[PDB]
Symmetry: D2
Subunit: 418 residues, 4 copies
């Protein structure tokens, strides 16, 4: 409803798919999924849980009474316990075995880790598409000379495609980082209130092996290759630093790229798509990318003051910054893909600017000729001042870019939103 | 709204309804049409002036809540001005303070915030009527070259919007430096609240003080015996976000090119509202905490008894010397007895028995009868209770005076 | 110092000698001794057993600091303040027993830091005022010089060079107001004792509260502060450090925006600082950025100070306070130098206006047409087609804007051909720009500069 | 340095001599000259008109740097690189004409910075490894020692001293993995020309692309890098600076958390950092670590901002910022690791205090064994809690065996140390013996 504040990330910017990943339906559904997996594995390992209790839970995974959970939360001041009661109300037989041996972080943290990994999996293809569209552009314009800029003053010629490779390289570094974080992300698993699994050890009457099995079993049900051995109550909040640092770095890359595009628009050498002509899409990318960089200080601060086995001063902050970083990243990648699909180049403006400055950039050619008038047209040919630019493009795209794009070949065809 | 898609936690969970509506979309387009009933304009005529109206309303909602927090803590500070408590530097036992004096550390920081929020609210200027690049060229042409009519128009809508003052100089926008000034003060407030709520969480570990806890409240899903400072922890958590947010407007302002670039717009839709919604939640939550603080004097007194003996050694020597003992002998004998008591505490896990040892040693016969008086906690608190009253009267109560009519409201939490 | 070990570029390269001296260890430890002397003086006046000869001994050795011996004491004790108490007591053997009487380390640590902060603000203020003044001269001189306006960095309604300069001046004036406010409202820690209770001083004056308050007020006045805290822990509240570095961070943002504009104006060839690269402006941006970054230090520090003090503030503050001020010092000096030597190229400014103004001017041309034979509709539609033709020449052929040539050639505009020079006159497109400049400078700028009139003449030098 | 002007406490107080030397001007300008020599060497080998005597002249004067003359040239020119070219040419009069042949300032500026960063990472890695190793010894030694667990800093189910130590070790191991990765993946700028096109070098080799690639690869190997960028502007991408300072910022957070825990353990009297006999016992070393670690976290916003506003092939608004933040991040990291090593070598534990605190909370720690049950114990627990706090009494679950209460803690320690920690320490086995000294 427009009568109260609504995040522009929900109402304006981010994709439906990313919005669903950070939704409360997906969150509390996944809590129930985790409670089911715990009960399943606990029964398999010999605890007194009946087939009918398990079926009851399985039938009501998505049957979530939000109104009743809010009333319980107002009464108890504990969101996890509110949802245990609410789940126990629609599963009266199972009510007594839900959450058996566990702490709130069993559902809280593991859900957050499932969410993070799904969210990374949504970002990766979009980033790959951005890189791919820019790679097409870079190849197509590999040989098109353009005035180089250092200190934003006229400098030795480069090419439009070579400059595009500066942007592509930064984005490829981001793709490498996002892949790494996604692949190295570990599950909290089943660890108990302070990470000792003391509760589960007592439930299995001192059988260490059964405890390790339980941990490994729910880890596999959730689709993770690996779980922590060491935790406190929580997974280490250093994980949140690693994830938001990579998104912050992506922010910087996008901000630089979109800043270049905005400058190229002033120069009239290049313009973003349009369905006075302003680079509004690039400006929005910069704007949002900035927020992405800002957000890195949240998890840095959070992790630095976590006392002992956990303090709850992480919780509210994480409800805000994790979702917003991903929703912001999602919007920037979509928007940048749309930009890269529709870039318009104006070679006659590019050539005119070179003609105005190239004379100053030469003179050394004219002296070398003198040492030995009719040659002047050939000596001021812009193509000869670009050094190895077009050769650099081809070598870079082949050796460094195309191999990173290979795994996303099947999803390349999707066109952007806006 | 729905739970089938993402909602901001500040909207769904934390934010007061008034502050929610201040950053509301309906409230934004009411203000936009209010501003056109008040034509050669640019988008920022409604965009920026609405944002300035919103900021000022939002500050006006925060101010009373902060004042109430200060007032509740001031009541607490007066009530406990003389209650001795162990001082802490490096979080090690240190010269005694009082519960109320410590509360004044918190009150002072919050008063500095109230001064800052008042200042920013009062000095906030209106963009007014300025045209596409701030030259008013459109309005000058509409009034066929009459400069005076243009200045009047600017001054007139400025007054209709309820601002004392408008910029002379703008580009298309009001300078985004204004956004730095507003979020810097909220960031500083964040730091104050984080420190205070961190102290409260430590006091809970020490069992000297606890935040309010409802009859039916559950601390933990797994440990039923637990009572956690979860309200204070949430305050810290949100206060941190408030500090983080200051880098948004700092960065935004630094890269605004010429008379305006639009890379401010999306960022400002996020950070301005969220800073105010975050501040709103923390003030309401901290008010609720301060209204319900529970103190445990018996624990406070026990901790003093355990540590005071070590603090008091200089008093005991001065007494011994006054009774005609030797500073050298006295110092050396206390030193040995102190290490013995220290080893009992650390190596045996026992109580501090230094007083028991001094009573048992016949070298201190001259001062045995003085020992109750020499270890009296009231004499170790210096000027603590006098500091409280002077501070409350000279520095705190005057800042609260304008909010006297709205002090009675209690702060509710539904989670 | 020596190039064989790391030196801060803020010391070795950037900041002024005067700011460097304010954050030096000589000034620091000299001021520790000054504060110990003031404490002894006031304590004697209020009746404590301190002789005139002990006071004179301390007064004679304020500058006589054995750094080698203080380092050896610090290696043995691991306490910098106590090391310096011993070292001071070694050259003042008679006074040794009464130095630091009743005090805690923060008596010298914090009060020195507050004296340093205030001196450092007093060095920044005039430099900022001079920057504002030089830009104000420039703004007045160029108040009427039309220049292309920029929104989204696209051509937009004309402004003037002086009016644009006022955007910069305004932000810097807000900084001057902020620095003045913080300087004036800065309070002294004074004499407060280990946990801020003054318990030690109360015992020294045998329970006389009034004598304790006078001691506090007396050393506060000797240090030259109008006001002291009533409430402290061991330290002054580290919120003070947030207030100071926030204002410097905001200044950073202002300077970064201004110097970014100047760098863009250099690309446009409309303006240059004193291949020609705007390296001074680029350095200002670079350093201004560090100034903005630094604000998160004190925000974090203050937020995790437990109870009456934790020492996790100390090392951080040795770095960030000095560096913020040294960075600010360099940026202001460098920006003053830039503003003193700005070179403008009006012929380039005029050429760029000629290229774009035709597109801006269509509304004037219609109003003239309506005033002649009329039809706003026909006029609008015919200009629209001719404008797209001229636009394609600019973008697709890389040519000059020929829209005026096309309007002269089209016989529909016969009624207004003779008006065209006057209708495209840049002076009439600048709205109230020059009037805004004069009103702003008089009402808002000159009054803030008035107190710094005597120090305006100093030129800002650069050695690299 | 002299105390009459401001000096960085990172130089004058905190960081090691070795890290200070790496960020010194002697090492910087010495390395500029080294890079000019390598360029001349490779250029001669590839056929450019450079004599053996010109190369010798340069090689003899690598360390012979006239700082006074370079400052005078820099005041005259306002270009530090060109000042040093003139100054170097002044002592190698024969070579003067071929110094910097074909190159741009970033050839010496950036490549030196990349050599410095790599060396600096190589100094940090062993110190971090030693910290992890000392804590690993401690963790094994105390794997079975029960201690009160803390969540929300309230008493919670028992852990062990060694298991808690593994929380710290894990975070630090993640840092070691990150520092290794960044060190190994760091690429050289190499030889790239004013705008990264190598146009100058292409013209010098009369259009021979292959010779240009060889030159790049040759100086890259002389500098000891496996790999160089293909793509650059004038500079290496400043995103590299984000990657390096992000990892150091994350390390800062880890150290801050650890040292915060230690400071809390000191209040509880369960554990204390080392003290020097001649030194109330405060955790001042841990407090300094926190203090400096904070600065390390703060610094990450410098390179994030810098990279985001680099226009086109380069803008010079990176330069001053990088002179400050790169050195300071590494010097700050250096100090924190050395100081934390010293702390971990001297940790003192007080088991009798640990045991007493457990005895005081034990009734609550048996509730997990005993577990609508929850609700009951909750009401009876608040009743017992009020007796403790409001009446000052013992915890009484009259209202209602230590051995099971630490769960799998000691087993977790052994599995973690063996599977995850010891393998990361293996390469640093030869340098483990060094003790970490502090002078203040
Ligand atoms: N308000 C503008 C401006 C502007 O003010 N000035 C124009 C002229 C004018 O609008 O009067 C100029 O070129 O000077 N440009 C874009 N927009 C709009 O900004 C909105 C973009 O939302 P975003 O997601 O980027 O925050 C969205 O509502 C629009 O894109
Ligand atoms: N100033 C103190 C304080 C303190 O205030 N102590 C009180 C008593 C108390 O607070 O317990 C006193 O007056 O003695 N504690 C340490 N230090 C010293 O601070 C120095 C810290 O240097 P760092 O490297 O951490 O910046 C370092 O040289 C010193 O350790
Ligand atoms: N290194 C350069 C560059 C540059 O890379 N220029 C190219 C050419 C070009 O891109 O235009 C070149 O090969 O020289 N420009 C300046 N300077 C110099 O950098 C010094 C910067 O000082 P700062 O105080 O900002 O760190 C300062 O002493 C010098 O200005
Ligand atoms: N895991 C825990 O220790 C824990 N302790 C309390 N809680 C509950 O989680 C919620 C936290 O909300 P917030 O993130 O706003 O602090 C509250 O309902 C609180 O009782 C937990 N999840
Ligand atoms: O809710 C839980 O399970 C844990 C709470 C706590 O550790 O206090
Ligand atoms: Cl669990
Ligand atoms: Cl307007
Ligand atoms: Cl004092
Ligand atoms: Cl090069």
């Amino acid at each position: 409803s427009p009568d109260s504040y609504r995040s522009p990330l929900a109402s304006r910017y981010a994709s439906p798919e990313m919005c669903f990943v950070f939704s409360d339906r997906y969150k509390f559904r996944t809590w129930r999924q985790l409670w089911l997996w715990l009960a399943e594995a606990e029964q398999t390992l010999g605890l007194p849980i009946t087939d009918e209790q398990i079926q009851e839970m399985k039938s009501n995974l998505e049957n979530i009474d939000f109104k009743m959970a809010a009333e319980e939360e107002k009464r108890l001041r504990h969101d996890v316990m509110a949802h245990v009661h609410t789940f126990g109300h629609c599963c009266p037989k199972a009510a007594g075995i839900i959450h058996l041996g566990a702490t709130s972080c069993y559902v809280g943290d593991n859900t957050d880790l499932i969410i993070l990994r799904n969210a990374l999996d949504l970002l990766l293809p979009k980033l790959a598409r951005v890189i791919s569209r820019l790679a097409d552009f870079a190849k197509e314009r590999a040989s098109l000379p353009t005035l180089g800029f250092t200190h934003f003053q006229p400098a030795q010629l480069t090419t439009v495609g070579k400059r595009c490779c500066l942007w592509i390289q930064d984005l490829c570094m981001d793709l490498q980082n996002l892949k790494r974080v996604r692949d190295d992300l570990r599950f909290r698993g089943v660890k108990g209130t302070t990470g000792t699994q003391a509760s589960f050890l007592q439930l299995f009457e001192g059988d260490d092996h059964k405890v390790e099995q339980l941990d490994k079993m729910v880890t596999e049900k959730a689709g993770f290759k690996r779980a922590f051995i060491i935790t406190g109550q929580t997974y280490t909040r250093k994980v949140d630093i690693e994830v938001l640092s990579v998104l912050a770095s992506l922010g910087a890359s996008v901000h630089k790229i979109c800043t270049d595009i905005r400058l190229l628009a002033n120069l009239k050498e290049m313009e973003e798509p349009f369905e006075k002509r302003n680079p509004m899409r690039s400006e929005r990318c910069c704007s949002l990318a900035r927020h992405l960089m800002t957000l890195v200080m949240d998890p840095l601060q959070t992790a630095s003051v976590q006392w002992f086995e956990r303090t709850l001063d992480d919780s509210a902050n994480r409800r805000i910054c994790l979702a917003e970083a991903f929703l912001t990243a999602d919007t920037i990648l979509n928007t940048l893909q749309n930009i890269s699909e529709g870039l318009v180049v104006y070679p006659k403006v590019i050539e005119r600017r070179i003609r105005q400055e190239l004379p100053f950039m030469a003179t050394e050619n004219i002296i070398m000729a003198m040492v030995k008038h009719s040659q002047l047209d050939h000596l001021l040919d812009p193509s000869s001042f670009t050094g190895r630019a077009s050769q650099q493009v081809q070598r870079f795209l082949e050796e460094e870019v195309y191999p990173l794009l290979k795994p996303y070949e099947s999803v390349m065809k999707v066109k952007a939103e806006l």
